[PDB]
Amino acid sequence: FRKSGDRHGWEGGVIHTLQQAVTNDSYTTFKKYSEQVNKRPPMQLRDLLELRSTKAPVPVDEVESITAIRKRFITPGMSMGALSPEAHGTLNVAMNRIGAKSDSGEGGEDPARFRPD
Amino acid sequence: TPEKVVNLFTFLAEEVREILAGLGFRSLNEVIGRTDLLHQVSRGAEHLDDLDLNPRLAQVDPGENARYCTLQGRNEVPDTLDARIVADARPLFEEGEKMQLAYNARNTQRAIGTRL
């Protein structure tokens, strides 16, 4: 990245916004993050598609619970050789805590981890 | 001594057996809810106005449901949000690990978080 041109997907301001929003729990800050991301001019195919419907809006309470959606995301594998063991363990702990499925990767796994703490 | 209480209840049941045999029945289910077996005797020497115990013997016909009948087990009760938790938190009850859950709560839902 340079200030001349060649727009990228991750710049400084967006990174800082995401980090502050995730460390401060301010969901309004995350909404500002999402508005900052979606506001950039087209860069991918998925920025050339609009979505519409025909029925009436439905209040947000009727939408299924948050946990039934969080249990759908997964964390793709990342080899223990690439990133330090601390990050691997933190990702595993968090994902197995919310209930989703984390991934190990190619670098295998330490046997002493095969039991809960 | 507990033997005293055991003997006391044995004696009570024995007397009940004897009087029920003398009455002309065979079990307790045959007598619960019947008031047409009682009668009133008064004290004529006291001359007081006879206590009108008649309303205490008023017998209303039960229809099809027996006077003593009762269903088995406790009466059911609708389920709250707690059920939705005990299905999504089963890893806790099988391994014992930390858990963080999130939900929307309406006012109709009652006693959120007692079954767990």
Side-chain angles (χ1 to χ4, degrees):
Chain A
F1 182 75
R2 290 292 195 259
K3 203 59 173 52
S4 69
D6 294 331
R7 301 280 303 282
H8 283 92
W10 301 79
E11 305 152 348
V14 59
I15 279 175
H16 267 100
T17 305
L18 166 59
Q19 268 196 356
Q20 290 182 31
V22 61
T23 190
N24 270 334
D25 317 287
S26 178
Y27 168 75
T28 313
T29 310
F30 199 98
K31 263 172 46 181
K32 173 188 168 192
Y33 168 81
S34 164
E35 175 171 329
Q36 268 204 23
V37 160
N38 265 321
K39 200 181 176 182
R40 297 209 298 264
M43 297 182 290
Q44 302 294 109
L45 288 174
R46 51 202 186 273
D47 286 331
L48 264 56
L49 305 186
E50 291 276 358
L51 49 90
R52 297 174 185 91
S53 166
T54 185
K55 306 191 189 304
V58 167
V60 300
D61 50 355
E62 297 295 324
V63 173
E64 64 192 331
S65 54
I66 285 188
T67 184
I69 281 183
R70 298 192 313 136
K71 285 187 55 184
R72 278 181 170 272
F73 306 152
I74 75 156
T75 294
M78 272 161 280
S79 88
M80 192 158 300
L83 53 89
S84 65
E86 315 295 329
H88 216 277
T90 291
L91 265 186
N92 265 19
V93 165
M95 297 311 294
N96 269 342
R97 166 186 299 186
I98 68 169
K101 316 177 184 179
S102 88
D103 194 357
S104 88
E106 193 170 9
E109 202 65 55
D110 190 299
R113 286 172 149 187
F114 288 144
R115 291 219 179 189
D117 274 350
Chain B
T1 304
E3 312 153 22
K4 291 186 186 302
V5 169
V6 177
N7 283 313
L8 166 64
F9 280 20
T10 294
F11 283 173
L12 264 296
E14 202 178 1
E15 175 169 335
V16 163
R17 273 210 75 191
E18 184 165 355
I19 179 56
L20 186 63
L23 197 65
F25 292 113
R26 308 170 198 280
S27 311
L28 262 294
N29 301 123
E30 304 169 343
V31 61
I32 299 180
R34 304 268 283 274
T35 79
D36 64 83
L37 312 182
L38 296 181
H39 283 82
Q40 172 188 1
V41 288
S42 309
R43 294 289 169 257
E46 210 155 343
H47 182 29
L48 79 164
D49 186 0
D50 187 73
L51 281 84
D52 200 312
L53 296 188
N54 164 52
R56 315 284 70 74
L57 280 76
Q59 176 168 343
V60 194
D61 271 296
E64 67 276 41
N65 292 330
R67 322 181 180 86
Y68 85 112
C69 183
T70 317
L71 58 87
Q72 297 142 341
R74 66 161 179 169
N75 287 136
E76 61 89 20
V77 60
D79 49 356
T80 181
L81 175 61
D82 282 33
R84 201 183 189 181
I85 281 182
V86 309
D88 295 0
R90 183 179 50 87
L92 166 61
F93 295 144
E94 283 184 5
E95 302 303 321
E97 71 277 41
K98 218 191 193 75
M99 293 285 292
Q100 194 264 17
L101 310 177
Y103 299 98
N104 300 72
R106 275 177 161 171
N107 64 333
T108 63
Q109 303 169 342
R110 288 176 302 180
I112 317 168
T114 70
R115 190 52 58 87
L116 178 137

PDB file of all heavy atoms in Angstrom, chain A residues 44-77:
ATOM      1  N   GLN A  44     -14.659  -5.602  -5.713  1.00  0.00           N
ATOM      2  CA  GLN A  44     -14.861  -7.026  -5.922  1.00  0.00           C
ATOM      3  C   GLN A  44     -16.159  -7.218  -6.693  1.00  0.00           C
ATOM      4  O   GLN A  44     -16.910  -6.269  -6.931  1.00  0.00           O
ATOM      5  CB  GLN A  44     -14.906  -7.779  -4.589  1.00  0.00           C
ATOM      6  CG  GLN A  44     -13.662  -7.618  -3.735  1.00  0.00           C
ATOM      7  CD  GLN A  44     -12.431  -8.230  -4.364  1.00  0.00           C
ATOM      8  OE1 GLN A  44     -11.531  -7.520  -4.808  1.00  0.00           O
ATOM      9  NE2 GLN A  44     -12.378  -9.556  -4.394  1.00  0.00           N
ATOM     10  N   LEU A  45     -16.426  -8.464  -7.086  1.00  0.00           N
ATOM     11  CA  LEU A  45     -17.684  -8.759  -7.763  1.00  0.00           C
ATOM     12  C   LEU A  45     -18.870  -8.527  -6.837  1.00  0.00           C
ATOM     13  O   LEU A  45     -19.884  -7.950  -7.245  1.00  0.00           O
ATOM     14  CB  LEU A  45     -17.676 -10.196  -8.277  1.00  0.00           C
ATOM     15  CG  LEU A  45     -16.758 -10.458  -9.467  1.00  0.00           C
ATOM     16  CD1 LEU A  45     -16.728 -11.933  -9.804  1.00  0.00           C
ATOM     17  CD2 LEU A  45     -17.212  -9.646 -10.661  1.00  0.00           C
ATOM     18  N   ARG A  46     -18.748  -8.943  -5.578  1.00  0.00           N
ATOM     19  CA  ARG A  46     -19.832  -8.832  -4.611  1.00  0.00           C
ATOM     20  C   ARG A  46     -20.162  -7.394  -4.238  1.00  0.00           C
ATOM     21  O   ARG A  46     -21.017  -7.187  -3.371  1.00  0.00           O
ATOM     22  CB  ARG A  46     -19.484  -9.626  -3.354  1.00  0.00           C
ATOM     23  CG  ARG A  46     -18.115  -9.301  -2.791  1.00  0.00           C
ATOM     24  CD  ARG A  46     -17.596 -10.423  -1.917  1.00  0.00           C
ATOM     25  NE  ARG A  46     -16.344 -10.060  -1.263  1.00  0.00           N
ATOM     26  CZ  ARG A  46     -15.147 -10.224  -1.808  1.00  0.00           C
ATOM     27  NH1 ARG A  46     -15.036 -10.749  -3.021  1.00  0.00           N
ATOM     28  NH2 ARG A  46     -14.059  -9.866  -1.144  1.00  0.00           N
ATOM     29  N   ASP A  47     -19.506  -6.404  -4.839  1.00  0.00           N
ATOM     30  CA  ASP A  47     -19.886  -5.009  -4.677  1.00  0.00           C
ATOM     31  C   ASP A  47     -20.708  -4.486  -5.844  1.00  0.00           C
ATOM     32  O   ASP A  47     -20.968  -3.281  -5.910  1.00  0.00           O
ATOM     33  CB  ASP A  47     -18.645  -4.132  -4.486  1.00  0.00           C
ATOM     34  CG  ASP A  47     -18.025  -4.292  -3.114  1.00  0.00           C
ATOM     35  OD1 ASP A  47     -18.770  -4.608  -2.164  1.00  0.00           O
ATOM     36  OD2 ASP A  47     -16.799  -4.096  -2.981  1.00  0.00           O
ATOM     37  N   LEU A  48     -21.118  -5.357  -6.765  1.00  0.00           N
ATOM     38  CA  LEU A  48     -21.932  -4.965  -7.908  1.00  0.00           C
ATOM     39  C   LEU A  48     -23.324  -5.582  -7.861  1.00  0.00           C
ATOM     40  O   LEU A  48     -24.021  -5.607  -8.879  1.00  0.00           O
ATOM     41  CB  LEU A  48     -21.232  -5.344  -9.212  1.00  0.00           C
ATOM     42  CG  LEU A  48     -20.414  -4.256  -9.904  1.00  0.00           C
ATOM     43  CD1 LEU A  48     -19.376  -3.693  -8.965  1.00  0.00           C
ATOM     44  CD2 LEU A  48     -19.750  -4.816 -11.146  1.00  0.00           C
ATOM     45  N   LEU A  49     -23.744  -6.078  -6.701  1.00  0.00           N
ATOM     46  CA  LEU A  49     -25.019  -6.762  -6.555  1.00  0.00           C
ATOM     47  C   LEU A  49     -25.853  -6.070  -5.489  1.00  0.00           C
ATOM     48  O   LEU A  49     -25.380  -5.849  -4.371  1.00  0.00           O
ATOM     49  CB  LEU A  49     -24.810  -8.232  -6.190  1.00  0.00           C
ATOM     50  CG  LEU A  49     -23.912  -9.026  -7.135  1.00  0.00           C
ATOM     51  CD1 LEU A  49     -23.892 -10.492  -6.753  1.00  0.00           C
ATOM     52  CD2 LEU A  49     -24.389  -8.860  -8.559  1.00  0.00           C
ATOM     53  N   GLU A  50     -27.089  -5.730  -5.840  1.00  0.00           N
ATOM     54  CA  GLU A  50     -28.059  -5.192  -4.901  1.00  0.00           C
ATOM     55  C   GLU A  50     -29.080  -6.267  -4.562  1.00  0.00           C
ATOM     56  O   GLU A  50     -29.261  -7.234  -5.303  1.00  0.00           O
ATOM     57  CB  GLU A  50     -28.765  -3.962  -5.475  1.00  0.00           C
ATOM     58  CG  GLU A  50     -27.875  -2.744  -5.631  1.00  0.00           C
ATOM     59  CD  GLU A  50     -27.749  -1.943  -4.351  1.00  0.00           C
ATOM     60  OE1 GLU A  50     -28.391  -2.314  -3.347  1.00  0.00           O
ATOM     61  OE2 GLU A  50     -27.009  -0.938  -4.350  1.00  0.00           O
ATOM     62  N   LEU A  51     -29.756  -6.089  -3.432  1.00  0.00           N
ATOM     63  CA  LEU A  51     -30.731  -7.060  -2.965  1.00  0.00           C
ATOM     64  C   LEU A  51     -32.035  -6.363  -2.608  1.00  0.00           C
ATOM     65  O   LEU A  51     -32.035  -5.316  -1.952  1.00  0.00           O
ATOM     66  CB  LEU A  51     -30.181  -7.855  -1.770  1.00  0.00           C
ATOM     67  CG  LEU A  51     -29.555  -7.105  -0.596  1.00  0.00           C
ATOM     68  CD1 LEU A  51     -30.588  -6.763   0.460  1.00  0.00           C
ATOM     69  CD2 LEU A  51     -28.433  -7.930   0.005  1.00  0.00           C
ATOM     70  N   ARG A  52     -33.146  -6.944  -3.059  1.00  0.00           N
ATOM     71  CA  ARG A  52     -34.474  -6.391  -2.845  1.00  0.00           C
ATOM     72  C   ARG A  52     -35.435  -7.533  -2.553  1.00  0.00           C
ATOM     73  O   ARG A  52     -35.074  -8.709  -2.626  1.00  0.00           O
ATOM     74  CB  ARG A  52     -34.945  -5.579  -4.059  1.00  0.00           C
ATOM     75  CG  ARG A  52     -34.086  -4.361  -4.347  1.00  0.00           C
ATOM     76  CD  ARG A  52     -34.484  -3.671  -5.637  1.00  0.00           C
ATOM     77  NE  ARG A  52     -33.571  -2.577  -5.959  1.00  0.00           N
ATOM     78  CZ  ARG A  52     -32.484  -2.708  -6.712  1.00  0.00           C
ATOM     79  NH1 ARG A  52     -32.172  -3.886  -7.231  1.00  0.00           N
ATOM     80  NH2 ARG A  52     -31.708  -1.659  -6.950  1.00  0.00           N
ATOM     81  N   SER A  53     -36.672  -7.179  -2.221  1.00  0.00           N
ATOM     82  CA  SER A  53     -37.694  -8.169  -1.897  1.00  0.00           C
ATOM     83  C   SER A  53     -39.058  -7.610  -2.281  1.00  0.00           C
ATOM     84  O   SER A  53     -39.161  -6.627  -3.020  1.00  0.00           O
ATOM     85  CB  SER A  53     -37.634  -8.547  -0.414  1.00  0.00           C
ATOM     86  OG  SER A  53     -38.803  -9.251  -0.031  1.00  0.00           O
ATOM     87  N   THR A  54     -40.115  -8.251  -1.780  1.00  0.00           N
ATOM     88  CA  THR A  54     -41.479  -7.799  -2.020  1.00  0.00           C
ATOM     89  C   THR A  54     -42.356  -7.761  -0.778  1.00  0.00           C
ATOM     90  O   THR A  54     -43.408  -7.113  -0.820  1.00  0.00           O
ATOM     91  CB  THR A  54     -42.170  -8.683  -3.068  1.00  0.00           C
ATOM     92  OG1 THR A  54     -43.465  -8.148  -3.362  1.00  0.00           O
ATOM     93  CG2 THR A  54     -42.330 -10.100  -2.547  1.00  0.00           C
ATOM     94  N   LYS A  55     -41.977  -8.423   0.311  1.00  0.00           N
ATOM     95  CA  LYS A  55     -42.813  -8.467   1.499  1.00  0.00           C
ATOM     96  C   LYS A  55     -42.492  -7.294   2.421  1.00  0.00           C
ATOM     97  O   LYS A  55     -41.585  -6.498   2.172  1.00  0.00           O
ATOM     98  CB  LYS A  55     -42.640  -9.800   2.222  1.00  0.00           C
ATOM     99  CG  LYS A  55     -42.880 -11.017   1.345  1.00  0.00           C
ATOM    100  CD  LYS A  55     -42.959 -12.286   2.176  1.00  0.00           C
ATOM    101  CE  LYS A  55     -42.972 -13.525   1.298  1.00  0.00           C
ATOM    102  NZ  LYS A  55     -44.078 -13.496   0.303  1.00  0.00           N
ATOM    103  N   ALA A  56     -43.247  -7.187   3.503  1.00  0.00           N
ATOM    104  CA  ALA A  56     -43.059  -6.098   4.443  1.00  0.00           C
ATOM    105  C   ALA A  56     -41.927  -6.416   5.414  1.00  0.00           C
ATOM    106  O   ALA A  56     -41.653  -7.584   5.697  1.00  0.00           O
ATOM    107  CB  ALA A  56     -44.343  -5.841   5.223  1.00  0.00           C
ATOM    108  N   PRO A  57     -41.246  -5.392   5.927  1.00  0.00           N
ATOM    109  CA  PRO A  57     -40.205  -5.631   6.929  1.00  0.00           C
ATOM    110  C   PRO A  57     -40.770  -6.297   8.174  1.00  0.00           C
ATOM    111  O   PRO A  57     -41.957  -6.184   8.485  1.00  0.00           O
ATOM    112  CB  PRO A  57     -39.678  -4.226   7.235  1.00  0.00           C
ATOM    113  CG  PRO A  57     -39.981  -3.442   6.004  1.00  0.00           C
ATOM    114  CD  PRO A  57     -41.281  -3.985   5.493  1.00  0.00           C
ATOM    115  N   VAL A  58     -39.898  -7.002   8.886  1.00  0.00           N
ATOM    116  CA  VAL A  58     -40.259  -7.758  10.078  1.00  0.00           C
ATOM    117  C   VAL A  58     -39.368  -7.280  11.215  1.00  0.00           C
ATOM    118  O   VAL A  58     -38.158  -7.154  11.026  1.00  0.00           O
ATOM    119  CB  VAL A  58     -40.104  -9.276   9.875  1.00  0.00           C
ATOM    120  CG1 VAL A  58     -40.163 -10.007  11.202  1.00  0.00           C
ATOM    121  CG2 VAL A  58     -41.176  -9.791   8.931  1.00  0.00           C
ATOM    122  N   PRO A  59     -39.915  -6.991  12.396  1.00  0.00           N
ATOM    123  CA  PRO A  59     -39.080  -6.497  13.496  1.00  0.00           C
ATOM    124  C   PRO A  59     -38.007  -7.502  13.885  1.00  0.00           C
ATOM    125  O   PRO A  59     -38.195  -8.716  13.786  1.00  0.00           O
ATOM    126  CB  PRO A  59     -40.081  -6.277  14.635  1.00  0.00           C
ATOM    127  CG  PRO A  59     -41.293  -7.070  14.250  1.00  0.00           C
ATOM    128  CD  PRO A  59     -41.339  -7.040  12.762  1.00  0.00           C
ATOM    129  N   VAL A  60     -36.870  -6.971  14.344  1.00  0.00           N
ATOM    130  CA  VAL A  60     -35.671  -7.774  14.563  1.00  0.00           C
ATOM    131  C   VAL A  60     -35.831  -8.830  15.641  1.00  0.00           C
ATOM    132  O   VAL A  60     -35.010  -9.749  15.716  1.00  0.00           O
ATOM    133  CB  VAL A  60     -34.478  -6.872  14.930  1.00  0.00           C
ATOM    134  CG1 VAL A  60     -34.191  -5.891  13.812  1.00  0.00           C
ATOM    135  CG2 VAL A  60     -34.754  -6.138  16.227  1.00  0.00           C
ATOM    136  N   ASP A  61     -36.859  -8.728  16.484  1.00  0.00           N
ATOM    137  CA  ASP A  61     -37.035  -9.718  17.539  1.00  0.00           C
ATOM    138  C   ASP A  61     -37.487 -11.061  16.982  1.00  0.00           C
ATOM    139  O   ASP A  61     -37.178 -12.106  17.564  1.00  0.00           O
ATOM    140  CB  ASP A  61     -38.041  -9.211  18.567  1.00  0.00           C
ATOM    141  CG  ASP A  61     -39.321  -8.724  17.929  1.00  0.00           C
ATOM    142  OD1 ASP A  61     -39.380  -8.687  16.682  1.00  0.00           O
ATOM    143  OD2 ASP A  61     -40.267  -8.380  18.670  1.00  0.00           O
ATOM    144  N   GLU A  62     -38.213 -11.056  15.864  1.00  0.00           N
ATOM    145  CA  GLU A  62     -38.713 -12.301  15.298  1.00  0.00           C
ATOM    146  C   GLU A  62     -37.622 -13.110  14.615  1.00  0.00           C
ATOM    147  O   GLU A  62     -37.801 -14.313  14.403  1.00  0.00           O
ATOM    148  CB  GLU A  62     -39.840 -12.007  14.313  1.00  0.00           C
ATOM    149  CG  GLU A  62     -41.052 -11.362  14.953  1.00  0.00           C
ATOM    150  CD  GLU A  62     -41.741 -12.281  15.938  1.00  0.00           C
ATOM    151  OE1 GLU A  62     -41.776 -13.503  15.683  1.00  0.00           O
ATOM    152  OE2 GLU A  62     -42.243 -11.785  16.968  1.00  0.00           O
ATOM    153  N   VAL A  63     -36.503 -12.480  14.259  1.00  0.00           N
ATOM    154  CA  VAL A  63     -35.387 -13.205  13.669  1.00  0.00           C
ATOM    155  C   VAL A  63     -34.817 -14.174  14.695  1.00  0.00           C
ATOM    156  O   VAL A  63     -34.786 -13.883  15.899  1.00  0.00           O
ATOM    157  CB  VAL A  63     -34.324 -12.214  13.169  1.00  0.00           C
ATOM    158  CG1 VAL A  63     -33.075 -12.941  12.705  1.00  0.00           C
ATOM    159  CG2 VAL A  63     -34.891 -11.370  12.044  1.00  0.00           C
ATOM    160  N   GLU A  64     -34.376 -15.341  14.224  1.00  0.00           N
ATOM    161  CA  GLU A  64     -33.866 -16.391  15.096  1.00  0.00           C
ATOM    162  C   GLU A  64     -32.747 -15.884  15.993  1.00  0.00           C
ATOM    163  O   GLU A  64     -32.095 -14.884  15.680  1.00  0.00           O
ATOM    164  CB  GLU A  64     -33.376 -17.578  14.270  1.00  0.00           C
ATOM    165  CG  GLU A  64     -32.195 -17.261  13.383  1.00  0.00           C
ATOM    166  CD  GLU A  64     -31.920 -18.361  12.382  1.00  0.00           C
ATOM    167  OE1 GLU A  64     -32.223 -19.533  12.688  1.00  0.00           O
ATOM    168  OE2 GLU A  64     -31.404 -18.054  11.288  1.00  0.00           O
ATOM    169  N   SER A  65     -32.522 -16.574  17.109  1.00  0.00           N
ATOM    170  CA  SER A  65     -31.586 -16.107  18.118  1.00  0.00           C
ATOM    171  C   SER A  65     -30.179 -15.991  17.548  1.00  0.00           C
ATOM    172  O   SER A  65     -29.822 -16.628  16.555  1.00  0.00           O
ATOM    173  CB  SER A  65     -31.581 -17.051  19.315  1.00  0.00           C
ATOM    174  OG  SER A  65     -31.329 -18.379  18.895  1.00  0.00           O
ATOM    175  N   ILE A  66     -29.372 -15.158  18.204  1.00  0.00           N
ATOM    176  CA  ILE A  66     -28.009 -14.919  17.746  1.00  0.00           C
ATOM    177  C   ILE A  66     -27.200 -16.208  17.767  1.00  0.00           C
ATOM    178  O   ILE A  66     -26.407 -16.471  16.856  1.00  0.00           O
ATOM    179  CB  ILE A  66     -27.350 -13.819  18.599  1.00  0.00           C
ATOM    180  CG1 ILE A  66     -27.899 -12.448  18.210  1.00  0.00           C
ATOM    181  CG2 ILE A  66     -25.846 -13.841  18.443  1.00  0.00           C
ATOM    182  CD1 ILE A  66     -27.168 -11.298  18.864  1.00  0.00           C
ATOM    183  N   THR A  67     -27.399 -17.042  18.790  1.00  0.00           N
ATOM    184  CA  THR A  67     -26.553 -18.221  18.941  1.00  0.00           C
ATOM    185  C   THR A  67     -26.756 -19.217  17.804  1.00  0.00           C
ATOM    186  O   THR A  67     -25.797 -19.871  17.377  1.00  0.00           O
ATOM    187  CB  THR A  67     -26.805 -18.891  20.292  1.00  0.00           C
ATOM    188  OG1 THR A  67     -25.901 -19.990  20.453  1.00  0.00           O
ATOM    189  CG2 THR A  67     -28.233 -19.394  20.393  1.00  0.00           C
ATOM    190  N   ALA A  68     -27.981 -19.334  17.287  1.00  0.00           N
ATOM    191  CA  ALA A  68     -28.226 -20.231  16.166  1.00  0.00           C
ATOM    192  C   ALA A  68     -27.530 -19.763  14.899  1.00  0.00           C
ATOM    193  O   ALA A  68     -27.381 -20.551  13.960  1.00  0.00           O
ATOM    194  CB  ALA A  68     -29.726 -20.371  15.915  1.00  0.00           C
ATOM    195  N   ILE A  69     -27.110 -18.504  14.851  1.00  0.00           N
ATOM    196  CA  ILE A  69     -26.322 -18.006  13.732  1.00  0.00           C
ATOM    197  C   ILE A  69     -24.832 -18.120  14.018  1.00  0.00           C
ATOM    198  O   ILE A  69     -24.053 -18.497  13.139  1.00  0.00           O
ATOM    199  CB  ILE A  69     -26.733 -16.557  13.414  1.00  0.00           C
ATOM    200  CG1 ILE A  69     -28.029 -16.546  12.612  1.00  0.00           C
ATOM    201  CG2 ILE A  69     -25.642 -15.843  12.648  1.00  0.00           C
ATOM    202  CD1 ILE A  69     -28.461 -15.169  12.194  1.00  0.00           C
ATOM    203  N   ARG A  70     -24.414 -17.814  15.248  1.00  0.00           N
ATOM    204  CA  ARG A  70     -23.002 -17.926  15.597  1.00  0.00           C
ATOM    205  C   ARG A  70     -22.512 -19.360  15.496  1.00  0.00           C
ATOM    206  O   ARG A  70     -21.343 -19.592  15.171  1.00  0.00           O
ATOM    207  CB  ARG A  70     -22.758 -17.389  17.005  1.00  0.00           C
ATOM    208  CG  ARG A  70     -23.084 -15.923  17.168  1.00  0.00           C
ATOM    209  CD  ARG A  70     -22.560 -15.378  18.483  1.00  0.00           C
ATOM    210  NE  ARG A  70     -22.882 -16.251  19.606  1.00  0.00           N
ATOM    211  CZ  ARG A  70     -22.023 -16.571  20.564  1.00  0.00           C
ATOM    212  NH1 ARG A  70     -20.795 -16.082  20.540  1.00  0.00           N
ATOM    213  NH2 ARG A  70     -22.395 -17.373  21.549  1.00  0.00           N
ATOM    214  N   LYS A  71     -23.380 -20.336  15.756  1.00  0.00           N
ATOM    215  CA  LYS A  71     -22.960 -21.725  15.628  1.00  0.00           C
ATOM    216  C   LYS A  71     -22.740 -22.150  14.183  1.00  0.00           C
ATOM    217  O   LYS A  71     -22.400 -23.313  13.950  1.00  0.00           O
ATOM    218  CB  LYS A  71     -23.986 -22.648  16.282  1.00  0.00           C
ATOM    219  CG  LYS A  71     -23.944 -22.643  17.794  1.00  0.00           C
ATOM    220  CD  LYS A  71     -24.862 -23.704  18.363  1.00  0.00           C
ATOM    221  CE  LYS A  71     -24.537 -25.070  17.792  1.00  0.00           C
ATOM    222  NZ  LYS A  71     -25.491 -26.107  18.265  1.00  0.00           N
ATOM    223  N   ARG A  72     -22.925 -21.254  13.215  1.00  0.00           N
ATOM    224  CA  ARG A  72     -22.733 -21.585  11.810  1.00  0.00           C
ATOM    225  C   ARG A  72     -21.349 -21.230  11.292  1.00  0.00           C
ATOM    226  O   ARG A  72     -20.809 -21.962  10.459  1.00  0.00           O
ATOM    227  CB  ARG A  72     -23.779 -20.874  10.947  1.00  0.00           C
ATOM    228  CG  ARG A  72     -25.113 -21.581  10.896  1.00  0.00           C
ATOM    229  CD  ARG A  72     -26.091 -20.847  10.005  1.00  0.00           C
ATOM    230  NE  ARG A  72     -27.288 -21.642   9.769  1.00  0.00           N
ATOM    231  CZ  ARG A  72     -27.411 -22.519   8.783  1.00  0.00           C
ATOM    232  NH1 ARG A  72     -26.410 -22.708   7.937  1.00  0.00           N
ATOM    233  NH2 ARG A  72     -28.535 -23.205   8.638  1.00  0.00           N
ATOM    234  N   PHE A  73     -20.767 -20.131  11.756  1.00  0.00           N
ATOM    235  CA  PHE A  73     -19.447 -19.729  11.301  1.00  0.00           C
ATOM    236  C   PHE A  73     -18.398 -20.719  11.778  1.00  0.00           C
ATOM    237  O   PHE A  73     -18.543 -21.353  12.824  1.00  0.00           O
ATOM    238  CB  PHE A  73     -19.090 -18.337  11.816  1.00  0.00           C
ATOM    239  CG  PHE A  73     -20.105 -17.284  11.491  1.00  0.00           C
ATOM    240  CD1 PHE A  73     -20.247 -16.180  12.306  1.00  0.00           C
ATOM    241  CD2 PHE A  73     -20.909 -17.391  10.373  1.00  0.00           C
ATOM    242  CE1 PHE A  73     -21.173 -15.206  12.016  1.00  0.00           C
ATOM    243  CE2 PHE A  73     -21.840 -16.418  10.080  1.00  0.00           C
ATOM    244  CZ  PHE A  73     -21.971 -15.324  10.903  1.00  0.00           C
ATOM    245  N   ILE A  74     -17.331 -20.853  10.995  1.00  0.00           N
ATOM    246  CA  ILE A  74     -16.186 -21.663  11.378  1.00  0.00           C
ATOM    247  C   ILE A  74     -14.927 -20.841  11.165  1.00  0.00           C
ATOM    248  O   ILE A  74     -14.935 -19.808  10.496  1.00  0.00           O
ATOM    249  CB  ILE A  74     -16.098 -22.986  10.590  1.00  0.00           C
ATOM    250  CG1 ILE A  74     -15.599 -22.726   9.171  1.00  0.00           C
ATOM    251  CG2 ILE A  74     -17.440 -23.690  10.564  1.00  0.00           C
ATOM    252  CD1 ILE A  74     -14.951 -23.928   8.530  1.00  0.00           C
ATOM    253  N   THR A  75     -13.832 -21.314  11.751  1.00  0.00           N
ATOM    254  CA  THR A  75     -12.539 -20.675  11.576  1.00  0.00           C
ATOM    255  C   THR A  75     -11.665 -21.564  10.711  1.00  0.00           C
ATOM    256  O   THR A  75     -11.343 -22.686  11.125  1.00  0.00           O
ATOM    257  CB  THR A  75     -11.871 -20.417  12.921  1.00  0.00           C
ATOM    258  OG1 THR A  75     -12.631 -19.447  13.650  1.00  0.00           O
ATOM    259  CG2 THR A  75     -10.463 -19.896  12.719  1.00  0.00           C
ATOM    260  N   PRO A  76     -11.270 -21.124   9.519  1.00  0.00           N
ATOM    261  CA  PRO A  76     -10.460 -21.978   8.648  1.00  0.00           C
ATOM    262  C   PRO A  76      -9.136 -22.348   9.298  1.00  0.00           C
ATOM    263  O   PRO A  76      -8.648 -21.680  10.211  1.00  0.00           O
ATOM    264  CB  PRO A  76     -10.243 -21.114   7.401  1.00  0.00           C
ATOM    265  CG  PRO A  76     -11.349 -20.123   7.429  1.00  0.00           C
ATOM    266  CD  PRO A  76     -11.609 -19.845   8.876  1.00  0.00           C
ATOM    267  N   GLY A  77      -8.558 -23.441   8.813  1.00  0.00           N
ATOM    268  CA  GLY A  77      -7.345 -23.954   9.411  1.00  0.00           C
ATOM    269  C   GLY A  77      -6.165 -23.022   9.223  1.00  0.00           C
ATOM    270  O   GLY A  77      -6.038 -22.323   8.218  1.00  0.00           O
TER     271      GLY A  77
END
